[PDB]
Structures are given as C-alpha cells and as structure tokens.
Amino acid sequence: MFKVYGYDSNIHKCGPCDNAKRLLTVKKQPFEFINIMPEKGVFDDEKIAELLTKLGRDTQIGLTMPQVFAPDGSHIGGFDQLREYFK
C-alpha cells in the first residue's frame, strides 16, 4: 500500500493531502492515511517521530504535509512528487 502522512482536513485543512488521496484512488492504488494531528492543535508525537525515522531526518525544517511513501517503502515526497511519480 502507499502510505500517506498528513492532516485530516476536517481538523486542519490540507488541500495537498486531499489531492494525494484522490490521485491514488483515480489510479486504483490502495493507500493507508496516517493523520498526524488527531485533534485541533494536538500533534501525535509518536507518528512525527516515525515519519522522521522513515525520512532519515534529524530536523523538521521545511517539512510539509503530505509525505508519501511508495508500496516498497521508498520515499516519494509531497503531492507534487506523487503527480510526477505516475508519469
């Protein structure tokens, strides 16, 4: 499955996050969405730590949501990189 880390737009608006989900649905690709903000103004720090581990990063500088990973686990990037991935 593709793995998409992002925000639920009902709690924190994330147009790129919603676009990533819809692009995977139109391409008939199963995905799992991981919401990093379970309620307004509260981050899930276990999921952010897991994301940093997967990215191999020590700082959060410049990280935006969504962050997408391919079925084999490699990092794709944000929605702009996912658009490119299917070409």
Put the structure in a nutshell.
It is classed as electron transport. The chain is an alpha+beta fold and 87 residues long.
Oligomer: monomer
CATH class: Alpha Beta
Structural class determined from secondary elements: alpha+beta
Q: How many separate structural domains?
A: 1
Distance between the termini: 19 Å
Question: Do you know the CATH topology?
Answer: Glutaredoxin
Shape estimate:
globular
Helix tally equals 3
CATH-defined architecture = 3-Layer(aba) Sandwich
- The portion of residues forming beta strands comes to 15-25%
CATH H level, superfamily name: Glutaredoxin
Q: Give the radius of gyration.
A: 12 Å
Share of helix, binned:
25-40%
Strand count, sense and barrel status of the largest sheet are: 4 strands, mixed
The total beta strand count reads 4
Write down the secondary-structure element order: EHEHEEH
Strand order of the largest sheet: 2-1-3-4
General description of the model:
The chain has 87 residues and is α+β, with helices and mostly antiparallel strands. It has a single domain (1-87), classed as Glutaredoxin. 34% of the residues lie in helices and 18% in strands. The protein has a 4-stranded mixed sheet, with helices on both faces. Strand 3 and strand 4 form a beta hairpin.
